[PDB]
Amino acid sequence: SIGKQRGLARLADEDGHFTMVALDQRPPLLQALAKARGIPADQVEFADMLAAKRLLVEALAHDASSMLLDPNFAMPAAIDVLPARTGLIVTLEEHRFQDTPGGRKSRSIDNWSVEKIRRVGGDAVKVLAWYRPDASDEVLQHQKDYVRTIGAECRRHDIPYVLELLVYPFPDESADKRADLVIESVREFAKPEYGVDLYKLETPLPAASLPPMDDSAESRAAAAQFAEVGSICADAGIPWVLLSGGAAPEQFERVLSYSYAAGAQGFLAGRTIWLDAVQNHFPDREAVLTALKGDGMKILKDLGRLTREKAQPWKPDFRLEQVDREGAFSCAYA
Amino acid sequence: SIGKQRGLARLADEDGHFTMVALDQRPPLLQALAKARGIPADQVEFADMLAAKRLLVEALAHDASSMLLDPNFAMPAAIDVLPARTGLIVTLEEHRFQDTPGGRKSRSIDNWSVEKIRRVGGDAVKVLAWYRPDASDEVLQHQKDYVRTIGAECRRHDIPYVLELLVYPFPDADKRADLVIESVREFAKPEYGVDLYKLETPLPAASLPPMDDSAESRAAAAQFAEVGSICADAGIPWVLLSGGAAPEQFERVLSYSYAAGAQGFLAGRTIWLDAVQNHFPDREAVLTALKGDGMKILKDLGRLTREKAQPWKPDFRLEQVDREGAFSCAYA
Amino acid sequence: SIGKQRGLARLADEDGHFTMVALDQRPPLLQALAKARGIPADQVEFADMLAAKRLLVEALAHDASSMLLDPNFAMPAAIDVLPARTGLIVTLEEHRFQDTPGGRKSRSIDNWSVEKIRRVGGDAVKVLAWYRPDASDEVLQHQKDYVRTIGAECRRHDIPYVLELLVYPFPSADKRADLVIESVREFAKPEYGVDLYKLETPLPAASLPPMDDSAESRAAAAQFAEVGSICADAGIPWVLLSGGAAPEQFERVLSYSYAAGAQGFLAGRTIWLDAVQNHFPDREAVLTALKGDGMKILKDLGRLTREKAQPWKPDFRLEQVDREGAFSCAYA
Numbered sequence: 001s002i003g004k005q006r007g008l009a010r011l012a013d014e015d016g017h018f019t020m021v022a023l024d025q026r027p028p029l030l031q032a033l034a035k036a037r038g039i040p041a042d043q044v045e046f047a048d049m050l051a052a053k054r055l056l057v058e059a060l061a062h063d064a065s066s067m068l069l070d071p072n073f074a075m076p077a078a079i080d081v082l083p084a085r086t087g088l089i090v091t092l093e094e095h096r097f098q099d100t101p102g103g104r105k106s107r108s109i110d111n112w113s114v115e116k117i118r119r120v121g122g123d124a125v126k127v128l129a130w131y132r133p134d135a136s137d138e139v140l141q142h143q144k145d146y147v148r149t150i151g152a153e154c155r156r157h158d159i160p161y162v163l164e165l166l167v168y169p170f171p172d173e174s175a176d177k178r179a180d181l182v183i184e185s186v187r188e189f190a191k192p193e194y195g196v197d198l199y200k201l202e203t204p205l206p207a208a209s210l211p212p213m214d215d216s217a218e219s220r221a222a223a224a225q226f227a228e229v230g231s232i233c234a235d236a237g238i239p240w241v242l243l244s245g246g247a248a249p250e251q252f253e254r255v256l257s258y259s260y261a262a263g264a265q266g267f268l269a270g271r272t273i274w275l276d277a278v279q280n281h282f283p284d285r286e287a288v289l290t291a292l293k294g295d296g297m298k299i300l301k302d303l304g305r306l307t308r309e310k311a312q313p314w315k316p317d318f319r320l321e322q323v324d325r326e327g328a329f330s331c332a333y334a
Numbered sequence: 335s336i337g338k339q340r341g342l343a344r345l346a347d348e349d350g351h352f353t354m355v356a357l358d359q360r361p362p363l364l365q366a367l368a369k370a371r372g373i374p375a376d377q378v379e380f381a382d383m384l385a386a387k388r389l390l391v392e393a394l395a396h397d398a399s400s401m402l403l404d405p406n407f408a409m410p411a412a413i414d415v416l417p418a419r420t421g422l423i424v425t426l427e428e429h430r431f432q433d434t435p436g437g438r439k440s441r442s443i444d445n446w447s448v449e450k451i452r453r454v455g456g457d458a459v460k461v462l463a464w465y466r467p468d469a470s471d472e473v474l475q476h477q478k479d480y481v482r483t484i485g486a487e488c489r490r491h492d493i494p495y496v497l498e499l500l501v502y503p504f505p506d507a508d509k510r511a512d513l514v515i516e517s518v519r520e521f522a523k524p525e526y527g528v529d530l531y532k533l534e535t536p537l538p539a540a541s542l543p544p545m546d547d548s549a550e551s552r553a554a555a556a557q558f559a560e561v562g563s564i565c566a567d568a569g570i571p572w573v574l575l576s577g578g579a580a581p582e583q584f585e586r587v588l589s590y591s592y593a594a595g596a597q598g599f600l601a602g603r604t605i606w607l608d609a610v611q612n613h614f615p616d617r618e619a620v621l622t623a624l625k626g627d628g629m630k631i632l633k634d635l636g637r638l639t640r641e642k643a644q645p646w647k648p649d650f651r652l653e654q655v656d657r658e659g660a661f662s663c664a665y666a
Numbered sequence: 667s668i669g670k671q672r673g674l675a676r677l678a679d680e681d682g683h684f685t686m687v688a689l690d691q692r693p694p695l696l697q698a699l700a701k702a703r704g705i706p707a708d709q710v711e712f713a714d715m716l717a718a719k720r721l722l723v724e725a726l727a728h729d730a731s732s733m734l735l736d737p738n739f740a741m742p743a744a745i746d747v748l749p750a751r752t753g754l755i756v757t758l759e760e761h762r763f764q765d766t767p768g769g770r771k772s773r774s775i776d777n778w779s780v781e782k783i784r785r786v787g788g789d790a791v792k793v794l795a796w797y798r799p800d801a802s803d804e805v806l807q808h809q810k811d812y813v814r815t816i817g818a819e820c821r822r823h824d825i826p827y828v829l830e831l832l833v834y835p836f837p838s839a840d841k842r843a844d845l846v847i848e849s850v851r852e853f854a855k856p857e858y859g860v861d862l863y864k865l866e867t868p869l870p871a872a873s874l875p876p877m878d879d880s881a882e883s884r885a886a887a888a889q890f891a892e893v894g895s896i897c898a899d900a901g902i903p904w905v906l907l908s909g910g911a912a913p914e915q916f917e918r919v920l921s922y923s924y925a926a927g928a929q930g931f932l933a934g935r936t937i938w939l940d941a942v943q944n945h946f947p948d949r950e951a952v953l954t955a956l957k958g959d960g961m962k963i964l965k966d967l968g969r970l971t972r973e974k975a976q977p978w979k980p981d982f983r984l985e986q987v988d989r990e991g992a993f994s995c996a997y998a
Contacts, residue, residue, distance in 0.1 A: 002413055006455040009418035046657055076661045079336055080650035084343035085419045111662040118452065119492045120665065121340040158453045179881035204881070217843035217868070220892055221885035228884055318414035324380050326360075329410045330445040333454065 002333070003158030004197050005316040008239075010123040011087040011160065011198070013065035016313030018198075018241045018266025019304045020087075021273065023056045024070035024126070026095040028271055029278075036282035050077035052282060056274055059292035061086045063300050068126055068268065071112045075120075089124040089162055090117040092150065101171055102136025106146050114153035124160035124198070125150065131165050133184040144188075151195030163189055164200035164243065164268075179204040179225045186229055190236035199233060199240035200268050203259070207251035213258060223258055230262030239265040239314045244272035249299045253306060260310040267307065273299050336665070337492030338529050339648045342571070344457040345421040345494070345530070347399040350645030352530075352573045352598025353636050355394050355605070357387060358404035358425040358460070362603050363610070370614035384411035386610055389617055391415050393624050394605070397632045402460055402600070404429075405446045409454075423458040423496055424451040426484065433505055436470030440480050448487035458530070459488050462498035467516040469504075478520070485527030497521055498532035498575065511536040511557045518561050522568040531572040532600050535587045536561055539579035542586050545593070555590055562594030571646045573598040576605075581631050585638060592642040599635055604628075668997070669824030670861050671980045674903075676789045677732040677753040677826070677862070682977025684862075684905045684930025685968045687726045687937070689719060689744075690736035690757040690792070694935055695942070702946035718942055719743035721949060725956050726937065727752050729964040734792055734932065737778045741786075755828055756788040758816065759795070767837055768802025772812050780819035790826035790862070791816065797831050799848040810852070817859030829853055830864035830907065830932075843868040843889050850893055854900035863904040864932050867919045868893055871911035874918045877925070887922055894926030903929040903978045908936050913963050920970055929978040930971055933964060 012018050025032075027041075033048050034041045050073060057078035061067060066087030069075055075090070082088060092112065098105040106129050117125045127150050129143050147163065154161035167181045182204040189196055203210075204225040211218045233240045242259050244252050244267070252272050256264070277291035323329045346352050361375075367382045368375040384407065391401065391412035400421025403409055409424070416422060426446065432439035440463050451459050461484050463477055481497065488495035499521060501513040514536040521528055535542075536557040543550040565572045574591050576584050576599070588599060605628035613619035655661050678684050693707075699714045700707040716739065723744035727733065732753025735741055741756070748754060758778065764771035772795055783791050793816050795809055813829065820827035831853060833845045846868040853860055867874075868889040875882045897904045906923050908916050908931065920931060937960035938952075945951035987993050 002409075003453055003455040006413065006418070006422075010455075012418070014419075046655075049658075050655075071662050071665075072655075072658045072660070075336075076652060076655040079340070079652075080648065083348075084340070084346070084648075085348070088340075109662060110659065111666075116662075116665055119337055121337040121344075121457075121492070123455075158455070176881045176885070183881065215892075217840040217847065217889055220888045221840065224884040224888040225881055228881075316414065320410060320413075323410045326380065326383075326406045327444060329406050330443060330450070333405075333450060334445075 001158065002318065002320075004154075004160050005318050007123045007160040008197060008314070009316050011066040011089060012266070012314050015308065016265070016315055017065065017304075017307045017311050018239070018268075018314065019063075019065045019300075019307055020068065020089070020241060020266060020268045021056075021060050021064035021066075021300070022068040022243070022268050022270040023053055023074050024068045024091040025270065026070060026073065028275075029053070029073075032275060032279045033282060035279050048283070049073045051285075052278055052288075053077040054081060055278075055285065055288050055292065057081050059289055060273065060297070060300065063297060063304065065266075066123070071109060071116075087123045088121070089126050090120070090122040091128075092117065092125050093127045093129070097130055099171055100136075100139060103132060103139030103143075103170065104130035104135075104168055105139060105142045106130060108150070114150065114157055114159065118157040118159050122159070124162050125154055126162040126164060126200070128164040128166060128200075129189070130168050131185045131189075132167050132170075132181050133188065134181065135170075147189060147194050151193070154197070155195050160197040161195055162198045162200060163194070163196045165189060166202055175205055175209055178206070183225065183228055183232070186232050190232050190238060192236075196236075196238055199238055200243050201229065201240050202243055202245055203247075203255045204229060207245070207247035207255050210251070210254045210258065213254065213261070223261065226258045226262035229259075230264065234263055237317075241266040241268050243268045244270050246271045246275065249302070253303065256303065256306055257310065260306070260312070263312060265311055265314040267303055269300060269303060335492060336650065336652065338488075338494050339650050341457045341494040342529060342646070343648045345400040345423065345496075346598070346646055349640055350597070350647055351399065351639045351643050352571070352646065353397070353399045353632075353639055354402060354421075354423070354573060354598060354600045355398040355400075355632070356402045356575070356600050356602045357390050357394070357408050358402050359603060360404060360407060360429040362607070363387070363407075366607055366611045367614060369611045382615065383407050386614060387411040388415060389620055390606055390610075393621055393629065394632065395420050397629065397636065398601075399598070400457065405443060405450075421457045422455065423460050424454070424456040425460050426451065427461050427463070431464055434470075434473060435505055437466060437473030437477070437504065438464035438469075438502055439473060439476045440464060442484075448484065448491050448493060452491040452493050456493065458494035458496050459484065460496040460498065460532070462500060462532075463521070464502050465499050465517040465521075466501055466504075466513050467520070468513070481521055481526050485525070488529070489527045494529040495527050496530045496532060497526070497528045500534055507538055507541055510538070515557065515560055515564070519564050522564050522570060524568075528568075528570055531565060531570050532575055533561065533572055534575055534577050535591070539577065539583040539587050542583070542590065545586070545589050555593065558590045558594035562591075562596065566595055569649070571597040573600050575600045576602045578602075578604060581634070585634070588635065588638060589642060592639070592644070595644055597643055597646040598639055601632055601635065605631060667824070668982065668984070670820075670826050671982050673789045673826040674861060674978070675980045677755060677828075678930070678978055679731040681972065682929070682979055683731065683968075683971045683975055684903070684932075684978065685729070685731045685964075685971055686734065686755070686905060686930060686932040687730035687732075687964070688734045688907075688932050688934040689722050689726070689740050690734045691935060692736060692739060692761040694939075695719075695739075698939055698943045699946060701943045714947070715739045716743035717947060720747060721942070721952055722938055723747050725953060725961070726964065729961065729968055731930075732789065737775060737782075753789045754787065755790040755792045756783045756786070757792050757794075758783065759793045763796055765837055766802075766805060769798060769805030769809075769836065770796035770801075770834055771805060771808045772796060774816070780816065780823055780825065784823040784825050788825070790828045791820055792828040792830065792864075794830040794832060794864075795853070796834050797849040797852075798833055798836075798845050799852070800845070801836075813853055814858050817857075820861070821859050826861040827859055828862045828864060829858070829860045832866055839869055839873055842870070847889065847892055847896070851896050854896050854902060856900075860900070860902050863897060863902050864907055865893065865904050866907050866909050867911070867923075871909070871915035871919050874915070874922060877918070877921050887925065890922045890926035894923075894928065898927055905930040905932050907932050908934050910934070910936060913966070917966065917970055920967070921974060924971070924974040924976070927976055929975055931967055933967060936960070937963060
């Protein structure tokens with residue numbers, strides 16, 4: 001359990017805040033580069049995927065406590081430009097899930113593993129599990145076994161397990177119906193058997209629907225859904241960060257205000273920072289950097305300000321067993 | 335070898351310098367605590383070893399790019415107070431070496447390994463190998479094989495291989511320079527997989543003349559140039575161990591070494607020995623003595639390092655990837 | 667503070683629950699009697715109002731820890747049939763409020779006062795204040811001043827101050843919840859001297875979903891918990907007005923309220939309206955209708971309170987006395 005705490009510490013900043021940037025995007029980045037070139041998604045070159053990810057790391061690493069890269073694209077594109085003090089979270093789930101009529105089934109990226117993420121000097125493993133509690137028993141069971149098996153792998157190599165949960169529509173409704181799917185998904189994977197060390201959660205209520213954060217009845221009703229998530233994570237002892245979901249900067253700031261009031265320890269900013277910077281200017285390197293250092297970095301710095309002011313600091317718990325003899329530590333760390 | 339490059343970058347500061355602090359002392363700390371407690375070394379409680387290492391890590395952490403910790407004492411004592419952005423080098427060699435008439439033999443700490451250092455979130459593995467080129471053939475084959483197997487273990491777990499080399503007397507200045515340099519040359523061979531060297535000065539610190547345009551200085555600088563040249567050809571950055579010299583002496587040693595290509599230092603016992611021995615267990619008295627001497631020395635070595643040391647740079651020479659999946663297949 | 671504590675204890679049962687019954691209805695009972703007699707309300711004889719109040723006190727005094735009586739109708743009508751052990755809360759507000767465009771303005775019943783309620787043997791004083799936070803500054807200034815002046819009367823006579831708050835329309839469920847909750851927050855301030863709160867549901871009774879683990883339930887419970895929080899911080903127990911909601915709906919409002927900390931209820935019109943309206947003045951037929959409906963409702967409400975409501979406990983928190991005479995000197 002030492003490597004898990006030391007790992008999480010390398011994902012948080014100096015003051016214990018998770019101000020993380022995500023760039024493991026496989027389909028969302030392919031559609032962003034296809035728009036920027038006018039060509040269909042299936043015509044985007046591999047070299048373009050590497051150039052876009054290399055640009056996001058150089059431009060955004062120095063203001064991210066930690067970054068999420070995928071093995072096939074972001075790693076060979078930008079590992080040499082990822083600063084040593086920036087934390088490295090590595091994606092393990094494969095973007096090509098199975099869209100069965102009973103639900104979505106997940107699997108790891110081929111020829112990539114928790115063992116390799118640990119070997120390459122990674123600080124954490126990230127798995128995204130598509131989940132909805134009302135899925136078929138076959139889908140629910142497959143997702144559970146996959147999440148639990150990666151948990152066992154992360155416990156074996158003592159490395160933080162970052163689990164991202166996302167709801168989705170079945171092939172071919174309400175804000176309260178959606179909060180029940182989100183919240184119960186969090187409740188399920190907070191169980192000790194899954195070995196989750198950090199959560200990457202979506203908002204249980206739509207960002208657009210959120211009212212201003214004041215002592216009003218409407219705001220109090222919304223805050224109750226966040227309070228429920230905060231309590232599930234606090235009882236399991238798992239910190240939670242919030243994924244942007246492509247909501248507007250104004251909206252994602254409001255999601256973070258309700259989340260931070262409920263206990264959330266940070267964010268994971270994806271498309272919300274760089275989607276427009278890439279789409280509107282690729283392949284012009286200097287034009288992409290002007291939007292990333294300008295407007296995109298503004299969003300990042302503003303979110304870090306709200307995080308520093310309102311997010312409760314994450315603190316490690318090295319609840320080490322009492323060693324009172326020379327040699328007992330080496331024997332106990334097995 | 336992305337892990338080796340990334341792990342080496344985690345041992346250096348943002349400028350590329352290695353300003354390391356060694357806190358893996360096992361017998362020297364026990365001796366310092368026997369004198370602090372006024373008792374025999376075999377009577378010092380394990381709690382005092384943890385207490386000493388915990389205040390040592392807390393006090394020195396902010397003036398070190400990386401710290402060297404031993405597993406049995408420094409790790410349970412201070413893993414929670416070692417900053418997240420301070421590099422963590424874990425010691426692997428056993429302090430109890432075998433003192434044979436033909437030379438010293440080395441081994442790993444029992445129930446500890448490269449895999450465990452990689453598991454725990456270590457940034458690099460450290461092995462000190464006692465070496466003399468004139469030791470018996472049995473001792474030479476034992477020392478060479480031990481260095482080589484840890485090299486294979488580190489290549490297997492893609493973790494940087496830090497190797498410390500030290501000469502010693504057999505059980506009873508140019509000769510010592512020959513022992514040092516020929517030891518550096520041997521373990522610079524590719525079979526050993528060394529990523530960073532921790533070396534003692536090839537010429538005695540006290541005998542070193544001022545760094546001027548004189549013949550005496552050129553003769554001295556030539557030994558450092560030979561060490562520098564061996565390491566540059568092998569692609570191994572080298573840092574120097576303080577070795578017990580006075581502050582002005584080690585500064586001069588660093589000045590000759592940095593001119594030869596050295597990329598940093600390793601500050602050992604001398605930073606804190608007097609502070610611990612004179613004031614333990616009074617925590618504040620130790621911290622106060624530390625600030626007035628040892629911590630000042632470390633700041634001076636850091637300003638000297640960023641002034642004269644040539645920066646180290648991560649050389650990622652990865653085979654260019656052309657398709658999705660090629661990276662995952664290649665990293666095998 | 668002793669009298670307020672003893673007075674509150676006498677409004678609750680020996681378990682600590684407020685199973686209160688409201689019998690201070692003036693125009694609602696007049697309308698019920700006009701419908702029973704088949705005559706206009708302005709033709710209803712004063713003796714019918716007394717016969718109705720007297721009927722209701724004898725009937726409901728069995729299942730009520732305390733009763734709310736009005737001075738001009740209930741007091742002459744049924745003080746002799748109100749059991750000594752049933753607490754007596756006496757109404758002070760005039761039913762004829764001033765219906766201004768900027769909001770409703772309240773006043774005390776003419777020739778009735780807090781001094782008289784204390785004198786006659788009353789356990790508590792009750793004031794209903796029509797309140798909206800968005801009413802005109804003049805109406806707000808009038809209501810705040812009236813509530814505060816009765817709170818001062820109650821501190822002077824050391825008698826409990828029961829304040830009932832009600833929203834009204836000028837001449838969305840979240841918009842009503844803001845009017846209700848912010849009204850509770852204003853009169854919970856220490857300057858008002860409120861001892862017990864009689865509150866309406868912040869969210870409509872019909873709208874309330876089942877008390878399960880759904881998001882729909884947590885959102886509804888949040889409004890109840892804000893009311894429960896404002897009242898626990900001020901040290902004011904809160905009960906709930908039935909407000910004409912159907913029995914199943916009131917039991918649901920009570921489950922949400924009791925989870926937030928409510929200590930009881932006040933049952934109004936619902937209990938007896940149809941019974942009196944349909945059978946008055948046939949005394950027996952009224953009691954027979956009451957037994958099959960209203961009395962059954964009250965038994966269920968009392969049972970639900972015994973199981974789910976938190977018991978109110980008296981906190982005398984008296985300053986310690988060390989001498990004979992100190993208590994008499996300190997109570998002034």
